[PDB]
Amino acid sequence: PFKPRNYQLELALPAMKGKNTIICAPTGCGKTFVSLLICEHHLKKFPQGQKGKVVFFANQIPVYEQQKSVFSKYFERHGYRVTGISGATAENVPVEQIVENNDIIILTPQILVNNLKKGTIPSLSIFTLMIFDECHNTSKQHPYNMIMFNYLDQKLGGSSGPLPQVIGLTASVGVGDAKNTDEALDYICKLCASLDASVIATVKHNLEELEQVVYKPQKFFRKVESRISDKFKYIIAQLMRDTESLAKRICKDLREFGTQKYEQWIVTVQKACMVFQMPDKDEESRICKALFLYTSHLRKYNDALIISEHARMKDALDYLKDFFSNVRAAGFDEIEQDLTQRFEEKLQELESVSRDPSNENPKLEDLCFILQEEYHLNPETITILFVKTRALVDALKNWIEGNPKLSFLKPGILTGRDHNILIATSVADEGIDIAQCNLVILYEYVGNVIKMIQTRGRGRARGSKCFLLTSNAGVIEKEQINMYKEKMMNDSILRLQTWDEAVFREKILHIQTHEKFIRDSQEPVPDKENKKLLCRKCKALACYTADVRVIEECHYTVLGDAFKECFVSRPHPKPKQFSSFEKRAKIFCARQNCSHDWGIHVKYKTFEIPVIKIESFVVEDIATGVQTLYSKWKDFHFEKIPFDPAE
Amino acid sequence: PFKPRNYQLELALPAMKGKNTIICAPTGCGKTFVSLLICEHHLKKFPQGQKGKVVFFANQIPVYEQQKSVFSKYFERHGYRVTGISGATAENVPVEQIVENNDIIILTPQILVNNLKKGTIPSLSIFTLMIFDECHNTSKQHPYNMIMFNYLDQKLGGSSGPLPQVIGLTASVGVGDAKNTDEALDYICKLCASLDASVIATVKHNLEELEQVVYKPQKFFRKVESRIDKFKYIIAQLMRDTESLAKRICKDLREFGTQKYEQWIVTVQKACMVFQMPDKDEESRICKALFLYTSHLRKYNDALIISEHARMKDALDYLKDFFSNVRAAGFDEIEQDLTQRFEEKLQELESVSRDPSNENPKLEDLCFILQEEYHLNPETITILFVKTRALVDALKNWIEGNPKLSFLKPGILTGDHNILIATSVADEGIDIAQCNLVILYEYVGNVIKMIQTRGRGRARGSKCFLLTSNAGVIEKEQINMYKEKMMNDSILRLQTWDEAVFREKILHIQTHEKFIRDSQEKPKPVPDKENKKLLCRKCKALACYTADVRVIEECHYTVLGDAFKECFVSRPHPKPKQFSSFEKRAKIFCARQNCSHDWGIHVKYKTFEIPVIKIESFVVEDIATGVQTLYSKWKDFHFEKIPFDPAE
Amino acid sequence: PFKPRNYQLELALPAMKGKNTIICAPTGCGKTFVSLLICEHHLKKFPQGQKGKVVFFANQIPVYEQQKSVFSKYFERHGYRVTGISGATAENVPVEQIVENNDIIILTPQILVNNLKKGTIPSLSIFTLMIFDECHNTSKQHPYNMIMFNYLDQKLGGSSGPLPQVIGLTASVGVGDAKNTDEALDYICKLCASLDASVIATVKHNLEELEQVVYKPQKFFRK
Amino acid sequence: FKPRNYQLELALPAMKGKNTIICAPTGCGKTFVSLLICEHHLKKFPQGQKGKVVFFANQIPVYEQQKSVFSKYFERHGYRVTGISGATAENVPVEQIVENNDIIILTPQILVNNLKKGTIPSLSIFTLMIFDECHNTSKQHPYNMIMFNYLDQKLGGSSGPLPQVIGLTASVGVGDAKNTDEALDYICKLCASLDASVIATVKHNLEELEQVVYKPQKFFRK
RNA sequence: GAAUAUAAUAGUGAUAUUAUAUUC
RNA sequence: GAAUAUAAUAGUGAUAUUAUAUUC
RNA sequence: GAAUAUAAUAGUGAUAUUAUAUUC
RNA sequence: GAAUAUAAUAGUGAUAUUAUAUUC
Ligand SMILES: *O=P([O])([O])OP([O])(=O)O[C][C]1O[C](N2[C]=[N+]([C])C3=C2N=C([N])[N]C3=O)[C]([O])[C]1[O]
Ligand SMILES: *OP(=O)(O)OP(=O)(O)OC[C@H]1O[C@@H](n2c[n+](C)c3c(=O)[nH]c(N)nc32)[C@H](O)[C@@H]1O
Ligand SMILES: *OP(=O)(O)OP(=O)(O)OC[C@H]1O[C@@H](n2c[n+](C)c3c(=O)[nH]c(N)nc32)[C@H](O)[C@@H]1O
Ligand SMILES: [Mg+2]
Ligand SMILES: [Mg+2]
Ligand SMILES: [Mg+2]
Ligand SMILES: [Mg+2]
Ligand SMILES: [Zn+2]
Numbered sequence A: 001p002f003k004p005r006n007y008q009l010e011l012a013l014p015a016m017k018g019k020n021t022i023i024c025a026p027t028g029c030g031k032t033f034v035s036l037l038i039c040e041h042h043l044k045k046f047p048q049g050q051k052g053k054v055v056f057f058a059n060q061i062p063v064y065e066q067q068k069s070v071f072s073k074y075f076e077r078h079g080y081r082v083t084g085i086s087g088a089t090a091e092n093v094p095v096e097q098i099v100e101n102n103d104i105i106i107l108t109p110q111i112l113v114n115n116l117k118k119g120t121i122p123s124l125s126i127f128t129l130m131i132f133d134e135c136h137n138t139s140k141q142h143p144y145n146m147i148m149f150n151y152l153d154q155k156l157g158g159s160s161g162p163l164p165q166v167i168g169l170t171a172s173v174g175v176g177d178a179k180n181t182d183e184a185l186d187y188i189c190k191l192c193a194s195l196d197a198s199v200i201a202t203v204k205h206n207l208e209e210l211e212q213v214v215y216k217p218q219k220f221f222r223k224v225e226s227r228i229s230d231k232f233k234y235i236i237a238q239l240m241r242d243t244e245s246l247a248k249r250i251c252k253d254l255r256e257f258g259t260q261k262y263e264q265w266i267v268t269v270q271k272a273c274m275v276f277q278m279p280d281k282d283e284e285s286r287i288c289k290a291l292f293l294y295t296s297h298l299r300k301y302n303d304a305l306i307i308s309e310h311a312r313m314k315d316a317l318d319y320l321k322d323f324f325s326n327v328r329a330a331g332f333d334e335i336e337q338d339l340t341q342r343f344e345e346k347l348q349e350l351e352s353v354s355r356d357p358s359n360e361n362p363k364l365e366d367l368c369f370i371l372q373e374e375y376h377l378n379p380e381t382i383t384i385l386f387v388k389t390r391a392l393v394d395a396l397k398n399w400i401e402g403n404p405k406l407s408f409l410k411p412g413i414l415t416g417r418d419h420n421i422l423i424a425t426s427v428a429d430e431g432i433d434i435a436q437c438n439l440v441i442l443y444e445y446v447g448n449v450i451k452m453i454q455t456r457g458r459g460r461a462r463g464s465k466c467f468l469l470t471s472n473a474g475v476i477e478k479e480q481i482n483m484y485k486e487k488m489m490n491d492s493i494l495r496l497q498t499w500d501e502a503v504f505r506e507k508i509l510h511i512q513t514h515e516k517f518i519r520d521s522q523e524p525v526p527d528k529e530n531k532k533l534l535c536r537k538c539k540a541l542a543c544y545t546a547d548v549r550v551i552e553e554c555h556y557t558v559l560g561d562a563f564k565e566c567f568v569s570r571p572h573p574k575p576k577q578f579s580s581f582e583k584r585a586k587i588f589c590a591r592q593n594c595s596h597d598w599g600i601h602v603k604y605k606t607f608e609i610p611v612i613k614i615e616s617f618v619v620e621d622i623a624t625g626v627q628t629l630y631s632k633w634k635d636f637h638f639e640k641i642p643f644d645p646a647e
Numbered sequence B: 001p002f003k004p005r006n007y008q009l010e011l012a013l014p015a016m017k018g019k020n021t022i023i024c025a026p027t028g029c030g031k032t033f034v035s036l037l038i039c040e041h042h043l044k045k046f047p048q049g050q051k052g053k054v055v056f057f058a059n060q061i062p063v064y065e066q067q068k069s070v071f072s073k074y075f076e077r078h079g080y081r082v083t084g085i086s087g088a089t090a091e092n093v094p095v096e097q098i099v100e101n102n103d104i105i106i107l108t109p110q111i112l113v114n115n116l117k118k119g120t121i122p123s124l125s126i127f128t129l130m131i132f133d134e135c136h137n138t139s140k141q142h143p144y145n146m147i148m149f150n151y152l153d154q155k156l157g158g159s160s161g162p163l164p165q166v167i168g169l170t171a172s173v174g175v176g177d178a179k180n181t182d183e184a185l186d187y188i189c190k191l192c193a194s195l196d197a198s199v200i201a202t203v204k205h206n207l208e209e210l211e212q213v214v215y216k217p218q219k220f221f222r223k224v225e226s227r228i229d230k231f232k233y234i235i236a237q238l239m240r241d242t243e244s245l246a247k248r249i250c251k252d253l254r255e256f257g258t259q260k261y262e263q264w265i266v267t268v269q270k271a272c273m274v275f276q277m278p279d280k281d282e283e284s285r286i287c288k289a290l291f292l293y294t295s296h297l298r299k300y301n302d303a304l305i306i307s308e309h310a311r312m313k314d315a316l317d318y319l320k321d322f323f324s325n326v327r328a329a330g331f332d333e334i335e336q337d338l339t340q341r342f343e344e345k346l347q348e349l350e351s352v353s354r355d356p357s358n359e360n361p362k363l364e365d366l367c368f369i370l371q372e373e374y375h376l377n378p379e380t381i382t383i384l385f386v387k388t389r390a391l392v393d394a395l396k397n398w399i400e401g402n403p404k405l406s407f408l409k410p411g412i413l414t415g416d417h418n419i420l421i422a423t424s425v426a427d428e429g430i431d432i433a434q435c436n437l438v439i440l441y442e443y444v445g446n447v448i449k450m451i452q453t454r455g456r457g458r459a460r461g462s463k464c465f466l467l468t469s470n471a472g473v474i475e476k477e478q479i480n481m482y483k484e485k486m487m488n489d490s491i492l493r494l495q496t497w498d499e500a501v502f503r504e505k506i507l508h509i510q511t512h513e514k515f516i517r518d519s520q521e522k523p524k525p526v527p528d529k530e531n532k533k534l535l536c537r538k539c540k541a542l543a544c545y546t547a548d549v550r551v552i553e554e555c556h557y558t559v560l561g562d563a564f565k566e567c568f569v570s571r572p573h574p575k576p577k578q579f580s581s582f583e584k585r586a587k588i589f590c591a592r593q594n595c596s597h598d599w600g601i602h603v604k605y606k607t608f609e610i611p612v613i614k615i616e617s618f619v620v621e622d623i624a625t626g627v628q629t630l631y632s633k634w635k636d637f638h639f640e641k642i643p644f645d646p647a648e
Numbered sequence C: 001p002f003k004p005r006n007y008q009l010e011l012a013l014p015a016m017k018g019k020n021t022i023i024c025a026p027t028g029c030g031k032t033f034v035s036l037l038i039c040e041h042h043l044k045k046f047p048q049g050q051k052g053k054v055v056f057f058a059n060q061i062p063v064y065e066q067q068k069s070v071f072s073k074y075f076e077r078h079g080y081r082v083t084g085i086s087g088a089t090a091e092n093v094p095v096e097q098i099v100e101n102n103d104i105i106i107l108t109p110q111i112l113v114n115n116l117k118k119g120t121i122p123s124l125s126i127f128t129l130m131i132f133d134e135c136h137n138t139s140k141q142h143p144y145n146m147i148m149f150n151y152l153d154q155k156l157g158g159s160s161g162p163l164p165q166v167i168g169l170t171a172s173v174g175v176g177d178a179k180n181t182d183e184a185l186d187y188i189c190k191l192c193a194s195l196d197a198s199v200i201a202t203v204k205h206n207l208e209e210l211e212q213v214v215y216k217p218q219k220f221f222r223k
Numbered sequence D: 001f002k003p004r005n006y007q008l009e010l011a012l013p014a015m016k017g018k019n020t021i022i023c024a025p026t027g028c029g030k031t032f033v034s035l036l037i038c039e040h041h042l043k044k045f046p047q048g049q050k051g052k053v054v055f056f057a058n059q060i061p062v063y064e065q066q067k068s069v070f071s072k073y074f075e076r077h078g079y080r081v082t083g084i085s086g087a088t089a090e091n092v093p094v095e096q097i098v099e100n101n102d103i104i105i106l107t108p109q110i111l112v113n114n115l116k117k118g119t120i121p122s123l124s125i126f127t128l129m130i131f132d133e134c135h136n137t138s139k140q141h142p143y144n145m146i147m148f149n150y151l152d153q154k155l156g157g158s159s160g161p162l163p164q165v166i167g168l169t170a171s172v173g174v175g176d177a178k179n180t181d182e183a184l185d186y187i188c189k190l191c192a193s194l195d196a197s198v199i200a201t202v203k204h205n206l207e208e209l210e211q212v213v214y215k216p217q218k219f220f221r222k
Numbered sequence E, F, G, H: 001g002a003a004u005a006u007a008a009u010a011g012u013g014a015u016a017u018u019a020u021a022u023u024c
């Protein structure tokens, strides 16, 4: 083995005495070793005639694989059978038998949730020690919090069995919407109540050792103003008012370009447009479809304005060109040809402006400055760059590759499902420990306190730096308050460590009883009338609510050979074997040049069936006639006829 | 059991004597009982230490089912096991054990062919009796003759195995293209050679009994005058420039409204797809335009023909349906242009389809006939035969679209009711309702079909009208009526021969044909290892490469790689069949814009879900030279054919 | 192919859930189509890597031939090999081979009894569904009861072989020498135990449909 | 991962279902051959059936290595990979661990003991067996014992569905043979020991194999 | 030839007799 | 999807086109 | 396909829209 | 502790001794 650091022993200590401990320590100080310590001690604690059963909850699959590997190779030599159950290997298997025949089990929490609800696992008394990776997640309706709901429901009751010790691991417990230390302490106590925790473990005695292991990178604030003059926006504005005029040639207008309020307004406008009714129901299709294409088009224009605001004009122009070309590759329409022909008119001027040197972004200029300087002082620099969207990932990557100034940069991509600089959208929690970046750069990217603290893990080496480039003061302040909330966090934790076990446990039990009472006191009318499901783009008859069958009380399919004529299929670009289903292809509308995303086509059990989403269908009651729109399927209450194999 | 006819015993007598014989009896005199009698005698002739094994050959599934049920219901009581194997129940089952563990096996011939070729069934020595239903099909490359090729190849060889007795069943052996009796004689001898028959059994000493059961319907010939042009001087110019705006693109070196015009448009269309162009981008535009133009032209031709044979209203509704489907398959500038030109002149029409002034005299003659025959007998059951499947519901809508024929209840028979409209039934087939009236609307086939059609009305008083506006049809029927005489006379002449002499003439012909077939084998392909690019035929978009194409069971062709998966779209198959070890899951079309040209189908082969394509939907470009060649069949396209391997 | 009565679906419902079921319905309601539905659904329920094997038990030869005919005509199209073995075609034939190589097998019960006793058929595990026509004969030592004796003797013993679902078809289970209610009930329970049944399917919801298809004839007594 | 060609050439006979003795120089990469064979074998069964692979390693380091690889590789595709060694074998239900998993890595002595104890009915529960260092399959070695069970069930009256056998080695040996024919018969005896019908060797991709694994020059000092 | 079931008739019954039907 | 047959048409023919039907 | 979380924006908020990420 | 393999040395060999290594 290897000699463990003293602060790791210090963090493991509260948990090794058998207390439900939330361990809060810096990202990358070696929490895995602590986990192995606590687990080893826990399993060694039991006498003859009984062997403990530990379970480790990991949120993401990489963490699942990592921890499963480490735990296996570490503990198998000591005679402890280690297993793991992920989403893939959790179907058609006796999960109960797998749990009982193993000492250590690495799980994703959704599995245990579904197993508890299904009843395959009776209670959590089977376990002796539950560990929560990224514990702080155990709030709201997170799977962690569901497991803990079962735990507390079993605890808070006369019929109580032997419950397992609950250990939590995190780098930040968070403080929520707190503005002062008291509210923060309240939030932290609520979290400890969520985990039935009585002790918060932080490094106190061996602080300096930890300060020589993990380092806090110096953070810098880069406030640059917007682009001075935008000819691009001056063109796209006019195009969008021409599109707005094309759309206003039909209906009433009941806002600023390049804004988010506009992006919401166009959504509500489109949603309101696909409700429009006509006795013809033929020209209605043309009007609604046009009022879909217009909306979507000027929406793409808005997106292009945002991209233009956060990157090169060439990036936005390439976004528009990409969009219109993908529209051109997928059939054609009179409206589509119209708008396109309108766009290519302004295209030449647009690239006359885009290929102009004076039309450069200062926000990218300062980034180029920081990159040039930091790579000049140290040409062995490993950079990471966080941005909001994927469009900005591609744009910044092409900007890096297409810049004489930055010919020393070999960019890489880290987008949700070697090099010098990685370009990523966001990473949930800490995740699998990646290569060390001595330069973190936040490009219009600011999250909460927990994410801020976790981000320090990227550069836990001495001399690491973290810049924050923005053209919005609200961003700067939003990052400023996070540090104050971290202060409030550590101070609240430090005051909470002064309390004695009795008082804290009493408070915890009190709170637990409180939201248990909230949950229990919390806990419908299906109109069996038939309704036509129409295409949200064509207003054409897709199906009927009677033909719709519901699988697993979550998924929805259509019955009859009548529906098979209404859609078309294209082999799924990203197939997946989720639950008891297997994605085979995507399903779109079939009426003329439409092809609107209706749903997918999957293999389920012994049937090849089409599954739809109500987010792309209009519900029309035949009697009343009025049309309505629904997002979640659960909002659409009706006679949900269950699925039967005899049809 | 049931008391049989005497002519049945007479027909079954040469077969029961153990001689390979062809039975020629009028349609519907009960050949089933003959089969049952022959089988019963053949099975119960054997001793105790030996057992017989009979195999029956039905060409189609209805006959398969019927014969299987009858044989099983009749022979089980006698202690014989009867089974059947068709294409549906042929997969994943040991057919040799099914054959061995049974006494009577009803088969579709393709099953036995495939099993013999594969090797699951060693030889035909297993059977002691083979019976061919509609044995007139024993010729050319038909599965029957494919079986008899095996039979003879074993017979005409040093390898000697106990070969089964061969019985044939038909109402006509045919005469081929014989101009005289001595040629028809040679044809019949050739057929008997193909079936290794030494006897031709017909009714003779009991004809007086037979002719009181099967009555020959009287055959009236109705020659009518043609239409005299409310739909001719309208679509004429339409065709004229719909050809010439295709000529606007390029010059291309023949009366309109005919079949020759169809062939012309077809070959032209198959000559436009190979227009190599350096621009490539607008090559797609040109080809996708010309394809649409020709596709409109030929269906215009179809409308013209339909008008020439039926109502003009249906000739309109045809085009209306066509443009409806075109508008439903996505709107194109060219398509909406031709559609605009069509609907511009559509106002002139429809009104023309609404005048009684221009009504097809053929349909009026048909109305006259039907009204007459249903006046004389209201309980008349009429069956009608048309050339194409287009004229079926055309004549149907003509019937109910007429108050004069309000006493008619049309029925359909293609792929309760007074009249049944149909295309063309293969052979005798499963027996349907007995008809008192048979009408042939421009429908004349071979002599065998003529003789077999008499089975539709084998009762007394049955009639058959041949309604046509062409003399060639009439003469084509008369030559058949002469061919029947030639056949019967040749048969009666052969029945005077000595059995031995006939046997050696048969043997002679057999050896001749065997030598021919043996020497017919040839060095056919030198596989081109050069990688060829397969493009679409309509929009000329790149479909795939020859390196990606795999061949399955030396017949079908799939595409590997994830590259091709982004080249096509799919919609659930209209008629989901199940052929071989496959299963039609859906259809497969192009993806380049709304081209939507049919490429093939998407099937479920074992544990794979794969695309299967037909070469007649693609253009074979050469990646090296650029010579765009076309192939109508996969076997005509010789290239480096790599057998499908699950390893991939 | 078409228009099944709703009471037929109601009767086939418990058997389409794998439950061993005795079906009790008036004579002439159409038990054949019920058998066809149950059997069909039983066949289409198996995945690709697995297959089913249904066996029908007819007590008489005419019923045998009729059922074999119907099942053959109906399931040939779908791709199921249907065969039959009676006393006339039972000698000098490989019953193991005939049973395996077919998906649906129609038998007279004495055949199965004899071939089980001989050892030619090892166990009933080869079957996935057994249907009994006139299942009220499952008593004393009628061939049905012997077959079920083998079934039970494999069930209750140490043998853990996968036993097939059991369906019975009758218009009257009988009461025997019962003189009151809970005697008749005990008799019926004894019969259900003889057939390993746990569900007795009868018409309850679609009575109004059935009573318009099958009429009870008025009875008279002339002394 | 970017595979080599000779690996595919070595795996191909095994993927066709034939029992195969793969003989290739040490260091060529038999691991990816194992992974490929296992992947193709498991992802070939229909829905109504499932595959069960068993991997035999004679040493604990090789055992934990292979277990690590197979677990980190087949978890994604949806196959439960587990391992049994001398440490964990005691006081555990073996047949349950075997049936509840798709890929089972173990030392041969384990399976021998559980076959002798009768806790496992037969090898029919497996569909693919893979002997690492299959040259050990001789004499009283555990490999040859397992194969003795296999052959006893094979040549016996019983007709249970037997798993296909893949062996992995760099040498098969020739024993105390003097000429090529005795060596041939000994090799045939080894093939009979593993019920193999094909000996996989690199042929059409030697130019690459030599580019990968080189042969060291030898010197003799007397 | 044998087996099986239903019914009537005597015995408390094991059953026996006859009738009827089915099966191998 | 593939194979086979029949009919018409172009052709000296091997063939080709279309129509129709069947089978695997 | 569905569920969960984070952030921005509208709203008093329960919520809603968008973006992002994850899970089954 | 037990089982197993490789090598050398004895011997006709089954085997034996020893060395080395592995596994349970
Ligand atoms: O088309 P398949 O490959 O699935 O095979 P099949 O049996 O239908 O062959 C029939 C031929 O006719 C054409 N076809 C097929 N479908 C489904 C249609 C058509 N033609 C029209 N006008 N409408 C159809 O729906 C094919 O070319 C095929 O070769
Ligand atoms: O599309 P599915 O119904 O199979 O579900 P999903 O898990 O794959 O989620 C995709 C959903 O997000 C939207 N979406 C964005 N982008 C860029 C894509 C894409 O490239 N391909 C697909 N199929 N969907 C995309 C969709 O709205 C979808 O619902
Ligand atoms: O016993 P068998 O070998 O004779 O065969 P079987 O089953 O057909 O006969 C059964 C018994 O019935 C008797 N029996 C024959 N006949 C013609 C009659 C009859 O007409 N009426 C009665 N009441 N019995 C008959 C046979 O003698 C045989 O014992
Ligand atoms: Mg085929
Ligand atoms: Mg006997
Ligand atoms: Mg789900
Ligand atoms: Mg021991
Ligand atoms: Zn639509």
Ligand SMILES: [Zn+2]
Pocket: B536, B537, B538, B539, B540, B541, B590, B591, B592, B595, B596, B597
């Ligand atoms: Zn195309």
